[model samples]
Target: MDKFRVQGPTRLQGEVTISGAKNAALPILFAALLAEEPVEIQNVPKLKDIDTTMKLLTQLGTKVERXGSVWIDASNVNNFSAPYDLVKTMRASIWALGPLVARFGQGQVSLPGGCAIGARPVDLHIFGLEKLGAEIKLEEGYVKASVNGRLKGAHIVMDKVSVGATVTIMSAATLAEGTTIIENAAREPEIVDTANFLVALGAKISGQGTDRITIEGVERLGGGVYRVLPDRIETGTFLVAAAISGGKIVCRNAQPDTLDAVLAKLREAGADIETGEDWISLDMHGKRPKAVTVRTAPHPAFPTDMQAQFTLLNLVAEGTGVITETIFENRFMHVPELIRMGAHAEIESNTVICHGVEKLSGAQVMATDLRASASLVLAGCIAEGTTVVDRIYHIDRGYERIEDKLRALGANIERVKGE
Candidate 1:
């Protein structure tokens, strides 16, 4: 296992370009299975989850060629089973189920487990697929689904606003017979990006970026090219890094409109923020940030993905701030790790209260999840002395060479081998 040794109290200053959205590229890559010809996707980040997806797709007989861009030739696929070995590493492997069943008429994918954030069940996915005329059965920790004929579209109202369920069902509906309408769909930018990818592959979809989406079934889809959207979460994380370190950073290739909620919170925390169409700059020099209460909700509100980073911000801010996490039950696992570093933080139910500290001495910290790992890295950037973060494989699953990005901004951080 690898760990990060970070020397803090350094003022970071630089420009970092954001990578493609991991949440968007995963489903769009899987949805390529519905196409008859090879598809080309650009801006795909090099990460552990993407490597696993490529391995799984190659195991399924899809020819995946990688360079600056990725070429996925899933048309010649011969296997439809996403084995437990691969699915266990990435929860996004469940995305293969709908595309496989829609194109091959059958698929067997293992049940998903990732991040330990909460119990994100696939019931909504099963509901949407069953409503589209697929027979579903759970057997030995796998989801076995098959359609007797072509999938017949139907109106599906999701029980909750779920991004995973929306991507699964929306990809499945691209080849369904007749028209499919999804009510209460997820409004995340990643969902809209995936939907646009499907549309580029000749799937007729409309009303993305809204609560309701309509998809008209097509006879077949052909190959096309798509550029994955920039990662908003990474952009937000770096913005937090700037504020926490009292540094200045300009994030390039970032979408400002997608992160309205996060930018709003950073401004409230007394950070000087400026935005253009494709970039956001943050400067927090000679300023001690003020704490702001935050609540995590779906898109167009504070994101659950950013809660951990914001929690780190609240630790050094001037006043006390409360963060209520409504998305996941066990997301506060990082709070204990933060407290281990001499933080004046307490957790009650799903809420975390953080009291600002003048300075924190660094210690050994463990990463509990993907976003939690980022939070630990931010803590290292501003804390006194050296902080070692263990279990960085969790960070590698999502972030693309995070230490290198931090190093570019003048942070003393490095990856240690066999430490």
Candidate 2:
């Protein structure tokens, strides 16, 4: 196990370039398994989840080559089965089912079990695949699916908007027969990027980034190269980093339009935020932000993924702050960790009530999840004295080169190996 040891009360300054979207890259990498020729992906983040996805791909007999931030090939996969051991690790592993069924006409994938937050059922994914002419059956904890010929598309209206389901269906539908229309689709920027990548690879898709997306299925897909967009959650993380540390930092390669809701809240909190074509800078010096209320929703709204970090920021605000998480049922796993660091927070149902404190005293903490780990890191950065955060592998699942990026911005944080 690795831990992040941080000496706090250091103002983070300097520009940090954001990496590719981890959420977007995972599904797109699974989509690459649908291609018969090499699909080169650029700007892929080096994260634990990516490595897990690569492991799953390799287990399925795909050859993956890496050069910097690019993934070279996944076209030669020789297996169609995704074992339970791999799929149970990350929900994104379920994405392999789509490409596997498309390529080999049969797929045996394990169902992704529960995580720290909620019961994220893959019923929508299975339902969507069934609509696409795949015979799906649940047997021995695995979702066994097969198609005699190429899959035929149908209209799928997701009961609730799920980003993972939307991406899986969209990627699979691209190689199905006839046309597929996804209603109540997820409009997250990552979904649009996946659709764009598929479009670049000879897929006819439209109405991405909206509630309704349509895909015109084709017999086969050719290999192509696509660059991933910068991570919006990371951009929000860095913005909150500036706010909590009371510093000025510029995050390059951020998409301003994608973060409209978060930026609005930050500006309302009295943070100096400026956006150009490709970069966004946050200047929080001498600015005591007023605590604000936030409610997480689907895309075009505040995201649940940023709730934990925002709660950490709220601890230092001038007034009380409230954050309501609508997506996940039990996402406040970091509250105890924050309280241990000398912050006042109360949780009731899906909302967290934060009372602003003058400053936080550093203490040892353990991270429970991905964003929760980031929240602990943020708290450690602004707290007084040294804070040791254990079990930081959760952070590595989403953040790529996090310590390096924080160090570039003058954060006294380092990854220490355990004996």
Candidate 3:
């Protein structure tokens, strides 16, 4: 149990390097289970979720080696079930279910009970797999699925846009018997990166960054190395950090193209920003940010993962800002905690209405989920006096040494070890 003791009214300066995308890395690591030989991945971030994925992979009998890069050999993956004890800690653990049944023809994964952000059901994963000729049954809190023969591809029109469903179905389709056409697939950059990783491993995939994706099943995928993309959510969070702290900072290894929506909003907040091929520099000296409303949707739009950060940004703005979260119903868990720190805001259904205030008096706050934890940290950075953010294990689940990153930017934040 570790917490962050952040002292506020400080300006963040200097350059910070961005890490790999956790969302992309998680599914790609699970998709590695389809490869016959050892697969290597570059730019994998060090996070609790990645460690949990490695544990699950090891439990399933893969030889995992992490030396700057990650090497996973699925040659000895004999275990076909992902137990609840492991799955309950992280939702992405369910991703192993797809490759498990696709490669071995049978898998049993317990239902995930992680994160109180929302009720993210596995119905979409089950429906997509069933369309691809796999028989799925839900019994006693577990998803038991198996295919009699090689999974034969079919046309799957997802009921709605789901990133997890798209990742699972796309990975499962790689080793299927024929072509699998997925309509209305999620158009997230992470999904595109996952698809590219599979392609690098000899899986034929196309139309990745669109609503319709097509995959041609190969006999067996040969092992190869792939690099995960930059973390867009983390990039967005730091962008908000620059604006909220009224500081100047440069984010290296960050792709500006992936953050068009968030950047536009930050510009609306009166932050001077510049972007190069792989870097984004922000200069917010002597600027009081303006309020900017944002609506969260599937990517190529404002991400739900960033709504919390923006909420804190709007709190210090000159006017009111509204944030509508369309992806998750329970994502506003941080609003109450923000109010505890002298924030003026109210929730109206799916939207949070934030009134700009000159300053916030810091207090003790609890972190509810991964992204919410980030918002609280940003809140601590801009608020007056000292703010202790409890339950930061939720933050460690995603961000890689965020306190160190902020410290490099001159933020007065430190980690407090707890028992």
Candidate 4:
């Protein structure tokens, strides 16, 4: 149980390089299973989720080698099943089911349980797999899927826009028998990155950044190298950190196209933001940020993962900020934690109303989930006196060297070890 102790009112300066996108790397790593030869992935962030995926792949018999942001040698595999103990820990574990079944012709993966946010159903993922000629059954607590011959691709219209499902189907369809077209797909930039990785592996894929994605199944996928995209959520988190602390920070490796919606909202809230081709800088000095209304949606919209961070920023805004979380039902778990820090906030269903306060006094806070943990960290960075945030393992799942990064930016933050 690691906790972060932060002494705030310090303006963060200097520049920080954003790590590889955790969201993109997860599915792309799983996509390597579709290849018969060794696949190399560069710029892989060292995080808990990535380590979990590597461990799970090793358990499934893939030889993995790690050397500072690169994973090499994953050709020889002897197993294809992902157990419940591993899959239930992260929602992205379900991604293994697709590549396992497509490459090995059979896969038995435990169904992913609900997270702290919502009851995220994998129905879309299962439906897409069935359309690709895989016979799937829910037996006990696992999903049993087997394909006859090579998987035959077919047209699939996702009932709802799901990023996880879209990436899963796209990765599996790469080596299927025929071509597969996905309609009403999630158009997040991560989807495009996944498609790009599959393409580099010799799979024919197009229309990744659009709502409809087309995958031309290939007989065999050859191993190759690919670099992951920058993390938009982390980019957004730094932007919020600058606004909350009234600091200035230059975030490297951030692409403006991936965060148009979030950046626009931050600009409207009085943060001075500027974007380059591969970086974004934010300055919030002498600016009194104003709280604005927001509604979370799918990609190309304000992301649900960023909702908690924005809520913390709103506490120091000039007026009331209203946030409607349309993506996850239980995402407001951090509202109470924010209130515990002497911030004024009210939760009504999925919507949260954050009233502007003069200042937030530091206190001990418990983080509930991944994004919530990040929000607490951001809150601690701007609060008065020392703020202790517990259960930071959730933050470690996505952020790579967060304390070190903040320290480079002049924030008085450190990880306190305990016995």
Highest TM-score, which number? 1
Give every collision pair in model 4: none
Each prediction's Cα RMSD?
2.7, 2.7, 2.8, 2.7
Question: Lowest-lDDT window of 10 residues in candidate 4?
Answer: 111-120
- Give Cα-based local distance difference scores for all models: 0.89, 0.85, 0.88, 0.84
| Whole-structure CA lDDT of model 2 | 0.85
**Per-residue lDDT of 1-419 in model 3, one digit per residue for the tens?**
79999998787678889999988999999999998989989999998888999999998999997965789999879999998888887888779888988899998888744222565688889889999899988775688889987898999988788899999999999999999999999999999999999999899999999999999999888788888889998988888788877788889889898899888888889999999999998888868789998899878888787888889889888999999988679778779999998999999999999999988878889877888888888888888999999999888878999999998888899999756
- Candidate 3, TM-score vs. the true structure? 0.92
TM-scores for the candidates: 0.93, 0.92, 0.92, 0.92
**Pairs with steric clashes in candidate 3:** none
- How would the candidate models be sorted by lDDT, starting from the highest? 1, 3, 2, 4
Candidate with more favorable, higher TM-score: 1 or 3: 1
Weakest ten-residue segment in model 1 by summed lDDT: 111-120
Q: Over the stretch 225-310, how does candidate 4's per-residue lDDT look in tens digits? A: 78889988988888887787778889998888999899999988988888899999899885667898899998888888789888
Off by over 4 Å in 2: 85-88, 111-120, 417-419
Mind giving the per-residue lDDT tens digits that candidate 1 earns over 1-419?
A: 89999998787788999999988989888998887898899999998778888998998889998875789997798998998887786778888889888888998888644223574677788778999999998754678889977898999988788889999999999999999999999999999999999988889999999989999999888997889999999999999988887788999989999999999999999999999988999999757779999999978899999999999999888999999988778788888888877788989899999998877778899876889998998888788999999989888878989999999998899999663
